[model samples]
Structure formats: C-alpha cells, structure tokens
Target: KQKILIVEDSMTIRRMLIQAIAQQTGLEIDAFDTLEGARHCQGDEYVVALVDLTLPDAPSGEAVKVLLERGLPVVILTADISEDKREAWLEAGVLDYVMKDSRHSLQYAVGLVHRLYLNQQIEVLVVDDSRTSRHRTMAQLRKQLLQVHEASHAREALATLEQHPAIRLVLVDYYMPEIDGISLVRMLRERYSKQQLAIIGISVSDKRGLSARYLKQGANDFLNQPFEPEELQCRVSHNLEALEQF
Candidate 1:
C-alpha cells in the first residue's frame, strides 16, 4: 500500500497535518513524532512524505536524510523560508520545499502533493533551432526529473507534440530560420488552447522587444536569453503551476 508518511516532531502540527491530509486525499496515512518511531513502521512504499527538518533524535534534518536515502519523494516541511536554506533542500533533491508559517501553508502542502501526483503524467517540449540552446533548456527540466522532449525548430516541434500528446508545456525560442516563435505560437494555440497548453517563448535579443508580440500571439510567458539557471527553472515551474490552477 502506498502511504503518506508524516514524520513530524510537534504534536499539534503533526495531528493537524494528519487530519488535513486525510481529508484532502483520503489516503491511508502513517504518522510518527520522531525518526525512531518512523523506522518501526517502515518497509512500506510511500506516495508522498512530509519530513520535518528538526526532530528530537534527528534534529538537524537527519530524518529527511534517511527518508530521501530510501528514495521517498520527500517534502521538507519547515518554518524556514530563507533563500540559502531552500537552495540546500533543492540540492538534496526533495520533491519541493514548503514553509509552514500559517494555516495557508497546510493547504499549500496538500496542493503540492496533488500536483506531484499529477506531475508523473506531465511532459514538456523545447523548441529551439540552436542545438546547444535546445539541450540547455532540456537539461533544466531534466534536473527537475520531469519528462521532457526536444525539437530543433517549430515544424519538428508540432510533430513531436502530435506524437506525444502528453506534452502540455512548450518552450519556444524567439529567433528561427523557418516558422519563427510567434508564428509557431499562433499555430500551437490553434489546437492547444491556452487552457490546454502553456508556451514560454525565449529570446536572445530584446532589440525589437518581442515579449508583447509573443504574449499576443498566444504564448503564455516570455524569457530573455542568458537567464540564470534558477530563473529558467522557476519560469517553467511557475507557469506549469498556473496551468494546473487553470
């Protein structure tokens, strides 16, 4: 049986999380107030895990370490939202991090679990003429462990989409030799409505200022070239979250 494991140390938060997630997912939950308690109920696989960073025995993220070593899709539930701390969690390959500051965070954590379950079926497409740029984009998505595909130009992009209907997000480059990004965005929007697909157009040049045009052409968002790796990843992630909301 796939379990939702809650390795929380606090009594109040742990009981609340159990109640909330049970109502939200209707899945069988296994709760523990410490790493030692969690170990006793082990040997079962999990769909999602909410591992608190601090525990009585494993106070400095040791519980998270053990859970992740077993390949649990762990989400670090913490009150810390500092930039450096979050980067450390991502580096450790947690599914995602959630800052539990208020009641709102509980719902967000539940929503994250839902999206993560859905993400297994989601795929992405990258449309760019430059070979390096194409894979550079692909590399980012792969780092997230997302299912991703690549297309050198717009025509190939459409064909790939036809072959794999699961691909709902496409990253298009602004400059192209045949069928530029705007034209391709228009073509894609014809079949994959805004509700169906999200298209983020990337550009090496902002000289003509084509962000507006791309959005007008049905692109969901625009990214300028030479963006930071974190920026690139966030742009894709945020847009996909929006797509999920709609």
Candidate 2:
C-alpha cells in the first residue's frame, strides 16, 4: 500500500521519474515540489521518498532531517556530490543518493529505486579483522538497505551465515589470521554455489592486483582499496543480481 514519493521542484523532472518508475515497479507514485508539500503527503503511506537536496522552501538539508526523523527511508536526488556532503549524508543515515542532473541520470535513478525495493529482502555479510573497516563498509551496505551481519574472521563469518540463513552475499577482506580470503572463498564454495551466495573480495593494504587472484579463488568479484563508495555500491549491486540470469 505504500507508494513511491517524488519530491522535486522541477515539474518536468518530477513527471519523468514518476512515469518511468511507476512503469518499472508498478508502484503508485506521488509527486511533490517542496518540503511543505512533502509534509502534506502524510508519509505514513510512502515506501521511500526521493528528495531533492535544495527545495524552494527548505534549501538546506532540513527536508532530509525531518523525513529521516519521521522514520522514512529517503534517497536524495542531487545534481552533484562531494566528499564532504557524502560523509554528511552517510552520517545522517540516508538510504541513498543519486546524481540526476540530466535525462540519462534520471533513468539510472529509476532503476536504482526499483532495485532498492528488492534489496530489502537481500542480506549481506561483512567479514574483516579490522573493526573500523567492517563498520565503514557495513555502513555503505546499509545505505542501500541491505541487511548486514558482522564477523571478525572466516570462522565467525561461516557461523554468522549459518545463523542468518537469509544472507545472499558476503564481503570478504583479503587478510585474516589463519583463514585468508582465498581459503574462505574455497571453503564457502564447497557449501554454497555462486548461484546461492555471492562473494566480493575487497582490501586496503594490497600489494598486487589481488583482485584477479580472488576471482580465480571463486569470488564473484573484487574491489581494491582505497575505492570510491559508488564503486563498491555498484559492484555489490551487480554481483547480487548476477545469479538471476540463468
């Protein structure tokens, strides 16, 4: 019963998203131009709100704060992004952000929103010895509404997956005490095929293109640090959906 809410000041942009996304997801769509208009919608009926950062009334990020405070997932649609604002958004705990300055970008936003809807049922596991790394990456996964469970090493990772049987993806860091990423991949492959569980290998202290090596070891994909947040997002999204074609 909850519908997609589009909050954009531009009429043309608003209509563009509503038409395409409604067709794709078959979800009812509502359009509003400003923060005041959004508040009028009575967000109890909204699945998620597509918010424009600068509204005519709420030009700052006030709209974002209010919606988040109201307990609605918000995906901000903006023209550009910077690290400062990205960190700010991340800290604010936004569902996600999309750059929609042109027609093509808006098209991508359509798919992103549609995918976010599906991601609610998809869970992911993050395995790493470094608590800082696990938390940071876990924050990124949470941005897309992906359920996450944490593990300090390979043994813990397997145990977590066993307990949370709904998990479909695992993010494995390159190094751990006795069970490194390679060993974990091999061990995991023995239990879950690529179709059932997807694994992505990422690392910050890499000395080589361990990416290819990870792939050879049965990982679905790999990302080397320091990587961009968007890059990780796209890679995770891709691998999560890769098993569907067959």
Candidate 3:
C-alpha cells in the first residue's frame, strides 16, 4: 500500500492531521514528532510527505529539503507562513504550503494530498488561443501531477478530445476567433455528458455575465480573470472529483 509521511511536532495537530487524512483519504499514514524520526524511514515507499516548517530538531525547514532529496513530493504544513516563505518554499520544489491556523486550512491541506494521489490517473485538457495563457494553465495542472493536453482552438480541442478520451477535465478560454468558449462548451456537451467530463471556462476578457453564459452553455465551472493560482487549482480538483461521483 502507498503511504503518506507526516512530520509534525504537536501531538494535537499531528493526530488531527493523521485522523483527517486517514479517515478522508484512506491512505496509510506515518506520523513522526521530529525530523530526526523521519530521517530513518524509507521515503520511496510514500507518495508524498507533509512536513512542518519548523520541527523540534530541524527548525529551519530542513525537513522539506530532506524529503525533497528523497524524491518525494513535500507540502509544508505550518502555523507560521509569509508571502516570502511561501514563495521560497514553492521555489524549493515543494508542491505547496497550507497554514495550520484553522480547521478549514487543515481540510484544504488534506484535500491537496488527496488530489495529489488521485491526479496521477487523471488527464486534463486546456484550450486557449493565447499560447501564454494556455502554457500558464497547463503548468498549474502539471504541478498537481496530472496528465495535461493542450489545444489552441475549438477544432483542436475537439480533435484532442477525440484522440484522448481519457481527459476528464477541460479548461476553455472565453474568447476565440473561430468559436467562443461557450459554443465550444455546448459542442463538447453534445459529445460528452457532465458526468463523463467536466468543463471550466476561463478568460481575461471583462465581459458581463461571462461566467453565467458559460455555465448556461454547459460549462461545469467558470473562473474570473486574474484569479489566484490556488483558486484555479481548487476548482480544477473539485470539478474533476465531482465527475468521479458517477
């Protein structure tokens, strides 16, 4: 069985993390109170590791380095975080970080881990006329360890879907010269049901009721322009899982 390594110092928070992850994800958990204990384990057996930023023995995010060196995906779960720290952690190759400051934050952390596990088998498609936008969106999906396919227009999107039916989620941009995202969504829906595939409309265009239009045209979700990366991540993960309930 695959395992999730957890290196946390506090008993209360540690148990909470374990219980939440164990119950919700049903993955085996390996919890330790210090980085010293974590050093002795074989990281290859685990899919990911949730490490505290400051452990009793290793106080300066040394645990993150150790786990990353072990070739495991590391996510920092800590009570203290700043913009600088978060950016640095992301630069250092961790999947992402979550604050341990609230119950909802804890749930979000667990959700990330759960998605990391499930995303491996999932395929995603991004359709945008702008190369920059499509690349950025594809990068986000790739960071989640998901198989990503890209299409520059509606025709390419349809052809890609036809060639790769394993794609479970698609992100369509609103403004395309040939066919707008709403029309693409409607066309896609003709071939794929909501239960079989999920679609999200996204664009930087400031159009009133754009989100409403996309949804009405059969999009499963919509993202406003200039959204946070986490917002996109959360929506993609949520939509993909929503399709799995069938």
Model 2, residue 95: C-alpha shift (Å): 3.5
> Candidate 1 vs candidate 3: which has greater lDDT?
3
Model 2, range 165-207, lDDT digits (tens) per residue?
Answer: 9888899988899999888998999898888999998865456
* Cα lDDT tens digits for candidate 3, 126-149: 999999988988887887879999
**Model 1 residue 158 CA deviation in Å:** 2.3
Q: Write the per-residue lDDT of candidate 1 for residues 36-108, one digit (tens) a residue.
A: 8877554346666889988998888988778877767688889868879877887887767767777777677
For model 2, how many clashes?
A: 0
Find the number of clashing residue pairs for candidate 3: 0
TM-score between model 3 and native: 0.90
Candidate 2 regions off by >4 Å?
40-45, 204-209
Clashes of each: 0, 0, 0
> TM-scores of all models?
0.77, 0.90, 0.90
* TM-score, structure 1 vs. true: 0.77
- Could you give me the TM-score of model 2 versus the true structure? 0.90
Backbone clash pairs for candidate 2 read: none
lDDT against the true structure, per candidate, is 0.79, 0.83, 0.85
Clashes of 1: 0
